Amino acid sequence: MGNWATHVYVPYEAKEEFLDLLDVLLPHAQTYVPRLVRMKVFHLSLSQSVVLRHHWILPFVQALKARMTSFHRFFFTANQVKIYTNQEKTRTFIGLEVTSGHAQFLDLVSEVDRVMEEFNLTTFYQDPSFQLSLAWCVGDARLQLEGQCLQELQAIVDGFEDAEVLLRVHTEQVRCKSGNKFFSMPLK
Numbered sequence: 001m002g003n004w005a006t007h008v009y010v011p012y013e014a015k016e017e018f019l020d021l022l023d024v025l026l027p028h029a030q031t032y033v034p035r036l037v038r039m040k041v042f043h044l045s046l047s048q049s050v051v052l053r054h055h056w057i058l059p060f061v062q063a064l065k066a067r068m069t070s071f072h073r074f075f076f077t078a079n080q081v082k083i084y085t086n087q088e089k090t091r092t093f094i095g096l097e098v099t100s101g102h103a104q105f106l107d108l109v110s111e112v113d114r115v116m117e118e119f120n121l122t123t124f125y126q127d128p129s130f131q132l133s134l135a136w137c138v139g140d141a142r143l144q145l146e147g148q149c150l151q152e153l154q155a156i157v158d159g160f161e162d163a164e165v166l167l168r169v170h171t172e173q174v175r176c177k178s179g180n181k182f183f184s185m186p187l188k
């Protein structure tokens with residue numbers, strides 16, 4: 001029945017205020033790299049993207065639910081613009097990196113990692129970061145986006161009047177995507 005792309009993350013509610021901020025940030029970045037495309041959904045990753053045999057999807061989700069069940073909602077800040085690539089430098093991203101709340105994400109990762117190991121899947125990246133990805137493009141666009149563009153994007157965010165949309169985000173759930181299936185679970 002195939003091996004399914006599996007990924008664990010914390011959903012980010014993309015409120016109108018956030019999407020309307022992106023309506024300013026993205027065209028600004030597109031003056032430097034027009035081919036940037038907005039992300040469709042937003043979240044903070046807690047696992048690598050792995051592949052899992054179909055037979056183990058529901059057991060994996062059950063194991064995750066049991067470990068995530070005891071964690072509480074918490075607040076985080078994501079208002080620092082970041083340019084990053086995938087490992088092979090064939091995709092570039094613009095994101096908002098988490099500052100306050102990073103430690104709480106690490107605690108979630110520690111429990112997700114145990115479920116990964118239980119299913120013979122890789123644990124999280126060695127030097128972890130958490131970020132809301134806003135937009136991406138093909139190729140390595142760091143030279144066009146780092147420097148002047150990055151500083152201008154940060155100035156737009158800094159000028160967003162400390163809006164709670166980025167400053168004090170209240171997490172509510174953990175979600176596992178496996179193929180075209182989405183399995184949610186609440187934080188307390």
Ligand SMILES: [Cl-]
Pocket residue numbers: 033034035036
């Ligand atoms: Cl372009």
